[PDB]
Coordinates of C-alpha atoms in Angstrom, one line a residue:
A298 CA 17.5 7.5 10.2
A299 CA 14.6 6.5 7.8
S300 CA 11.0 7.4 8.3
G301 CA 8.1 7.6 5.8
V302 CA 4.4 8.0 5.4
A303 CA 2.4 5.7 3.2
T304 CA -1.2 6.7 2.4
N305 CA -3.9 4.2 2.6
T306 CA -7.3 4.3 0.9
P307 CA -10.5 2.4 1.9
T308 CA -12.3 0.5 -0.8
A309 CA -16.1 0.5 -0.9
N310 CA -17.7 0.3 2.5
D311 CA -14.1 0.4 4.0
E312 CA -13.9 -3.4 3.2
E313 CA -10.1 -3.2 2.9
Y314 CA -7.4 -0.6 2.9
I315 CA -4.9 -0.5 0.1
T316 CA -1.5 1.2 -0.2
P317 CA 0.9 1.4 -3.1
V318 CA 4.1 -0.6 -2.8
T319 CA 6.9 -0.4 -5.4
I320 CA 8.6 -3.7 -6.1
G321 CA 11.5 -3.7 -8.5
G322 CA 10.1 -0.6 -10.1
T323 CA 6.5 -1.7 -10.5
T324 CA 3.8 -0.2 -8.2
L325 CA 1.2 -2.6 -6.8
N326 CA -1.8 -1.8 -4.6
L327 CA -1.5 -4.0 -1.5
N328 CA -3.5 -4.6 1.6
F329 CA -1.3 -4.0 4.7
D330 CA -2.0 -6.8 7.1
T331 CA -0.9 -6.9 10.7
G332 CA -2.4 -10.4 11.1
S333 CA 0.1 -12.1 8.7
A334 CA 3.8 -12.1 8.0
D335 CA 3.9 -12.8 4.3
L336 CA 4.5 -10.3 1.5
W337 CA 2.8 -12.0 -1.5
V338 CA 1.8 -10.6 -4.8
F339 CA -0.1 -11.4 -8.0
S340 CA 2.6 -12.2 -10.6
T341 CA 3.3 -13.1 -14.2
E342 CA 3.5 -16.7 -13.0
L343 CA -0.3 -16.8 -12.8
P344 CA -2.5 -17.8 -15.8
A345 CA -3.0 -14.7 -18.0
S346 CA -6.8 -14.8 -17.2
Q347 CA -6.1 -14.5 -13.5
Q348 CA -3.8 -11.6 -14.0
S349 CA -6.6 -9.5 -15.4
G350 CA -7.7 -6.5 -13.5
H351 CA -4.4 -6.4 -11.4
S352 CA -1.0 -4.8 -11.5
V353 CA 1.4 -7.9 -11.5
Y354 CA 5.0 -8.4 -10.5
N355 CA 7.3 -9.8 -13.1
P356 CA 10.0 -11.7 -11.1
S357 CA 12.3 -12.3 -14.1
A358 CA 12.8 -8.6 -14.7
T359 CA 14.4 -7.7 -11.4
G360 CA 14.1 -10.4 -8.8
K361 CA 16.8 -12.8 -7.6
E362 CA 15.2 -16.3 -7.4
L363 CA 15.6 -18.4 -4.2
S364 CA 15.7 -21.8 -5.8
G365 CA 13.7 -24.5 -4.1
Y366 CA 11.8 -22.1 -1.8
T367 CA 8.1 -22.1 -1.5
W368 CA 5.3 -20.4 0.5
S369 CA 1.7 -21.4 1.0
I370 CA -1.3 -20.1 3.0
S371 CA -4.7 -21.6 3.7
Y372 CA -7.4 -19.5 5.4
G373 CA -10.3 -20.6 7.7
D374 CA -12.8 -19.3 5.1
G375 CA -11.4 -21.7 2.5
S376 CA -9.3 -19.3 0.5
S377 CA -5.6 -20.1 -0.2
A378 CA -2.6 -18.9 -2.2
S379 CA 0.9 -20.3 -2.9
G380 CA 3.9 -19.9 -5.1
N381 CA 7.7 -19.3 -5.2
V382 CA 10.0 -16.7 -3.8
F383 CA 12.3 -13.9 -5.1
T384 CA 14.3 -11.2 -3.4
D385 CA 13.8 -7.6 -4.7
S386 CA 13.8 -3.9 -3.7
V387 CA 10.5 -3.0 -2.0
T388 CA 9.6 0.6 -1.3
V389 CA 6.8 1.8 1.0
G390 CA 6.4 5.6 1.6
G391 CA 9.9 6.3 0.6
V392 CA 11.4 3.6 2.8
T393 CA 13.3 1.0 0.8
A394 CA 14.0 -2.6 1.8
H395 CA 16.8 -4.0 -0.2
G396 CA 16.7 -7.8 -0.7
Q397 CA 13.2 -8.2 0.6
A398 CA 11.7 -11.6 0.1
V399 CA 8.7 -11.3 -2.3
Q400 CA 6.3 -14.2 -2.5
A401 CA 5.1 -14.5 -6.1
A402 CA 1.7 -16.1 -6.5
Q403 CA 1.5 -19.2 -8.7
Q404 CA -1.9 -20.3 -7.6
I405 CA -4.7 -18.3 -5.9
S406 CA -8.3 -19.4 -4.9
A407 CA -11.5 -17.7 -6.3
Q408 CA -11.9 -15.2 -3.5
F409 CA -8.5 -13.6 -4.4
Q410 CA -9.3 -13.9 -8.1
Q411 CA -12.5 -12.0 -7.7
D412 CA -11.1 -9.1 -5.6
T413 CA -9.6 -6.7 -8.1
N414 CA -9.1 -4.0 -5.5
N415 CA -5.7 -5.4 -4.4
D416 CA -2.7 -7.1 -6.0
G417 CA -1.5 -9.0 -2.9
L418 CA -0.8 -8.5 0.8
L419 CA 2.1 -6.9 2.8
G420 CA 2.4 -8.7 6.2
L421 CA 3.2 -6.7 9.3
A422 CA 2.8 -9.5 12.0
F423 CA 6.1 -10.8 13.6
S424 CA 8.4 -12.7 11.2
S425 CA 8.1 -15.9 13.3
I426 CA 5.0 -16.7 11.3
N427 CA 6.2 -16.1 7.8
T428 CA 5.3 -19.3 5.8
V429 CA 8.4 -19.5 3.4
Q430 CA 10.1 -22.9 3.4
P431 CA 12.7 -24.2 3.9
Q432 CA 13.8 -21.0 5.7
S433 CA 11.2 -18.4 6.8
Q434 CA 11.9 -14.8 5.8
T435 CA 11.5 -11.4 7.4
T436 CA 8.6 -9.0 6.9
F437 CA 9.1 -5.6 5.3
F438 CA 9.1 -4.1 8.8
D439 CA 11.6 -6.5 10.3
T440 CA 13.8 -5.9 7.2
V441 CA 13.9 -2.1 7.6
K442 CA 13.4 -1.7 11.3
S443 CA 17.0 -1.2 12.3
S444 CA 17.3 1.7 9.8
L445 CA 14.3 3.6 11.0
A446 CA 14.6 6.5 13.5
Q447 CA 12.4 4.4 15.9
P448 CA 11.5 0.7 15.4
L449 CA 7.8 1.3 15.2
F450 CA 4.9 1.9 12.7
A451 CA 1.6 3.6 13.4
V452 CA -1.7 3.5 11.7
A453 CA -4.7 5.8 11.3
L454 CA -7.4 4.0 9.2
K455 CA -10.4 6.2 8.5
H456 CA -14.1 6.0 7.4
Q457 CA -14.3 6.6 3.7
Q458 CA -11.2 8.9 3.7
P459 CA -7.5 8.4 3.1
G460 CA -5.5 7.4 6.1
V461 CA -1.8 6.8 6.8
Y462 CA 0.8 4.4 7.8
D463 CA 3.7 6.2 9.6
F464 CA 6.9 4.2 9.5
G465 CA 9.5 5.1 12.1
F466 CA 7.9 8.1 13.8
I467 CA 4.7 9.1 15.7
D468 CA 2.6 11.9 14.2
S469 CA 1.0 13.5 17.3
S470 CA -1.3 15.5 15.2
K471 CA -3.2 12.3 14.4
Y472 CA -4.6 11.7 17.9
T473 CA -5.9 13.6 20.9
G474 CA -4.4 13.6 24.4
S475 CA -1.6 11.1 25.1
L476 CA -0.9 7.5 24.1
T477 CA -1.6 4.7 26.5
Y478 CA 0.7 1.7 26.0
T479 CA -0.1 -1.9 26.7
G480 CA 2.3 -4.9 26.5
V481 CA 2.2 -7.3 23.6
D482 CA 2.4 -11.0 23.6
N483 CA 4.2 -12.0 20.3
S484 CA 4.6 -15.7 21.2
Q485 CA 2.0 -16.7 18.5
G486 CA 3.4 -14.1 16.1
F487 CA 0.6 -11.5 16.5
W488 CA 0.2 -8.0 18.0
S489 CA -1.7 -9.7 20.9
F490 CA -2.9 -7.6 23.9
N491 CA -5.2 -7.8 26.8
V492 CA -8.3 -5.9 27.7
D493 CA -9.4 -5.6 31.3
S494 CA -13.1 -5.2 30.6
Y495 CA -15.6 -4.4 27.9
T496 CA -18.9 -2.5 27.8
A497 CA -21.4 -3.5 25.1
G498 CA -24.1 -0.8 25.3
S499 CA -25.7 -1.4 28.7
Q500 CA -23.8 -4.5 29.6
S501 CA -20.2 -4.9 30.9
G502 CA -18.2 -8.1 31.2
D503 CA -14.8 -9.6 31.9
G504 CA -11.7 -8.9 29.8
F505 CA -10.1 -11.2 27.2
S506 CA -7.3 -11.2 24.6
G507 CA -7.3 -10.2 21.0
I508 CA -5.1 -9.1 18.1
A509 CA -4.7 -5.8 16.4
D510 CA -5.4 -6.8 12.7
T511 CA -5.5 -4.3 9.9
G512 CA -6.3 -7.1 7.5
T513 CA -9.7 -8.0 9.0
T514 CA -12.6 -5.8 8.1
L515 CA -14.8 -6.3 11.2
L516 CA -14.6 -6.5 15.0
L517 CA -14.7 -10.3 15.7
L518 CA -15.7 -11.2 19.3
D519 CA -16.8 -14.3 21.3
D520 CA -20.4 -15.3 20.5
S521 CA -21.5 -14.5 24.0
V522 CA -20.3 -10.9 23.5
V523 CA -22.0 -10.7 20.1
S524 CA -25.3 -11.9 21.5
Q525 CA -25.2 -9.4 24.4
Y526 CA -24.5 -6.6 21.9
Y527 CA -27.3 -7.5 19.4
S528 CA -29.8 -8.3 22.1
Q529 CA -29.8 -4.4 22.5
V530 CA -30.5 -3.7 18.8
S531 CA -34.2 -3.8 17.9
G532 CA -34.8 -6.1 14.9
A533 CA -31.2 -7.5 14.6
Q534 CA -31.2 -10.8 12.8
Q535 CA -28.6 -13.1 11.2
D536 CA -28.5 -13.1 7.4
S537 CA -26.1 -15.5 5.7
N538 CA -26.6 -13.6 2.5
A539 CA -25.3 -10.5 4.2
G540 CA -22.6 -12.3 6.3
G541 CA -24.0 -12.2 9.9
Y542 CA -26.1 -9.9 12.0
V543 CA -28.0 -7.2 10.1
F544 CA -30.5 -4.4 11.2
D545 CA -32.5 -1.6 9.8
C546 CA -29.9 1.1 8.7
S547 CA -31.8 3.7 10.7
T548 CA -31.1 1.8 13.9
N549 CA -29.5 3.7 16.8
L550 CA -26.6 1.4 17.8
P551 CA -25.0 1.2 21.2
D552 CA -21.3 2.1 21.6
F553 CA -18.8 -0.6 22.3
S554 CA -15.8 0.0 24.5
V555 CA -12.8 -1.9 26.0
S556 CA -10.6 -0.9 28.9
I557 CA -6.9 -1.3 28.1
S558 CA -4.4 -0.6 30.9
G559 CA -6.7 2.1 32.2
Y560 CA -7.7 3.7 28.9
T561 CA -11.2 3.3 27.5
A562 CA -11.1 2.7 23.8
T563 CA -14.6 3.4 22.5
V564 CA -16.1 2.5 19.2
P565 CA -19.1 4.8 18.6
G566 CA -22.4 3.1 17.5
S567 CA -22.1 5.0 14.2
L568 CA -18.9 3.2 13.2
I569 CA -20.5 -0.2 14.1
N570 CA -22.9 0.4 11.2
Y571 CA -20.8 -1.2 8.5
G572 CA -23.0 -0.2 5.6
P573 CA -25.7 -1.8 3.3
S574 CA -25.7 -5.5 3.5
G575 CA -26.3 -5.7 -0.2
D576 CA -29.7 -7.4 0.1
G577 CA -32.9 -5.5 0.8
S578 CA -33.2 -2.6 3.3
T579 CA -30.6 -3.7 5.9
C580 CA -27.2 -2.8 7.1
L581 CA -24.4 -5.1 8.3
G582 CA -23.1 -5.0 11.9
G583 CA -19.4 -4.1 12.3
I584 CA -19.4 -6.6 15.3
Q585 CA -19.5 -10.3 14.3
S586 CA -18.6 -13.7 15.6
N587 CA -14.9 -14.9 15.8
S588 CA -16.3 -18.4 15.2
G589 CA -15.0 -19.8 18.5
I590 CA -11.4 -19.3 17.5
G591 CA -10.4 -18.5 21.2
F592 CA -9.3 -14.9 20.8
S593 CA -10.8 -11.6 19.5
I594 CA -9.9 -9.9 16.3
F595 CA -9.7 -6.1 16.5
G596 CA -10.2 -5.4 12.9
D597 CA -10.8 -2.2 10.9
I598 CA -14.1 -1.4 12.6
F599 CA -12.2 -1.0 15.9
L600 CA -9.1 0.7 14.3
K601 CA -11.1 3.4 12.6
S602 CA -11.7 4.9 16.0
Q603 CA -8.0 4.9 17.1
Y604 CA -4.5 6.0 16.3
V605 CA -2.4 2.8 17.0
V606 CA 1.4 2.6 17.5
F607 CA 3.0 -0.9 16.8
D608 CA 6.2 -0.6 18.7
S609 CA 8.8 -3.4 18.4
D610 CA 10.4 -2.3 21.8
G611 CA 8.5 -4.2 24.5
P612 CA 6.9 -5.1 22.2
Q613 CA 3.9 -2.8 23.0
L614 CA 0.9 -1.1 21.4
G615 CA 0.0 2.5 22.1
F616 CA -3.6 3.8 21.7
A617 CA -5.3 7.2 21.6
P618 CA -8.5 8.4 20.0
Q619 CA -8.1 9.6 16.4
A620 CA -8.1 13.4 15.9

């Protein structure tokens, strides 16, 4: 039964976490994303100028083309990417998926162009939301799942230090105490779970639902929750240059916690200080608005505090504090 450990590394300020992936013999640095189900990469099909500062996949060397197939993604921030599809061998931490669908980029918007830290994304959401047409494809995980010792993956993202992605096994040395499991709702294709309650500093409120998303940098919550939080931070103000609420970097920030099936997952105030906003003497808040999308996004800020098990049996999510 297969198992493997892939190492992840945070970029500056922990903006994103990249991991090497070998596709058809070429190693690319990809962002692992539990909020999407596409495996797309920078390719030789892009304009030569757009290929600069990236490792690119050359489909013609080793890929099998799926003639007439397409993929295309549009994000709420206005970015987008599209292209064609090949099947190839994809290796992640010594686990190899034969005949994995690889979405080669043919067009990418400016935000992807400008980010030379990654060469694409590896989707770990449920396959039901893969965007390949006319027939959607399975994610790396769904492709290899049946060959793993256990049909799960676990993540420990860290603050400016290497972390891991464990495929097919749980590393108990990565957390303290025992795991607490909660049921997942994959009806919309996400690792969606419910919280019973939340405590923002000195104020507590009713629970809600959210998704576990390694691809989102911040903790995105309802604006009522965001206000409640920042009403407790002296001098907190919104700065469109920075990207949302900012504060004096010396600020003492309240903790944020959520109650999940009896377990209190706590994000310490020190992790909510994202870093310098890149404009004057302020820091960006790790908690920001979900823009009225209707559900919360438990991004990297939240995940840096926990060891998380993504278990396809249930499906369910296990949580414990990182060791």
